[PDB]
Amino acid sequence: VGSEVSDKRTCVSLTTQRLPVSRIKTYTITEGSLRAVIFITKRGLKVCADPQATWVRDVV
Amino acid sequence: VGSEVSDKRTCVSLTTQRLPVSRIKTYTITEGSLRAVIFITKRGLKVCADPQATWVRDVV
């Protein structure tokens, strides 16, 4: 972070009013050929974008 | 961001090599009391966090 603009895969952490969690959750959302990964942290929301890397299914 | 990060809700738009999306997709994930929202846009991945607020359910 700290202003990073990638054209490949960018991840961002945002720090908000957060409650602590023991372990980090990973949530995956597929959208066409885009993979959006959410990492749930005690500090906030950390998101990663993995677009068109591999061949992805158009939601199934 | 809007030159501000907020405990209330922070959102960030991240740059990625993405193909256009016909409709703006919105994905909601609940984790504990954290609302993670993903807005799928033609420019990449737009992430929103709506943590705690009032009543974030487990959604069962």
For residue B48, the cross-strand partners are B11, B37
Closest CA to B14 of A27, A11, A52: A11
Chain centroid, CA B55 distance in Å: 17
Q: Which residues contact B7 (CB under 8 A, 6 or more apart)?
A: A16, A17, B51
Domain with A47 in it: what CATH number?
A: 2.40.50.40
Chain A residues within an 8 Å CB radius of B22: none
CA A51, B11, B36, A1 torsion: positive or negative?
positive
Quickly list H helices, B1-60. none
Q: Which helix (H) or strand (E) holds A34?
A: strand A34-40
Alpha-carbon Rg for chain A, nearest whole angstrom, is 13
Q: Phi, psi at residue A37, to the nearest 5°?
A: -115, 125
Q: Give the number of A-B residue pairs with CB atoms closer than 8 Å.
A: 109
**B34 in Cβ contact with B52 (< 8 Å):** yes
Query: Which domain range does residue A39 map to?
Result: 1-60
For residue B26, the cross-strand partners are B39
Experimentally, the structure was elucidated by: NMR
Q: Which residues contact B28 (CB under 8 A, 6 or more apart)?
A: B35, B36, B37, B38
Q: How far is A60 from chain B (nearest CA, A)?
A: 15
Residues of B (40-59) whose Cβ lies below 8 Å from A = 40, 44-45, 47, 49, 51-52
Q: Phi, psi at residue A49, to the nearest 5°?
A: -115, 125
Closest CA to A44 of B40, B33, B16: B33
Q: What domain count does chain B have? A: 1
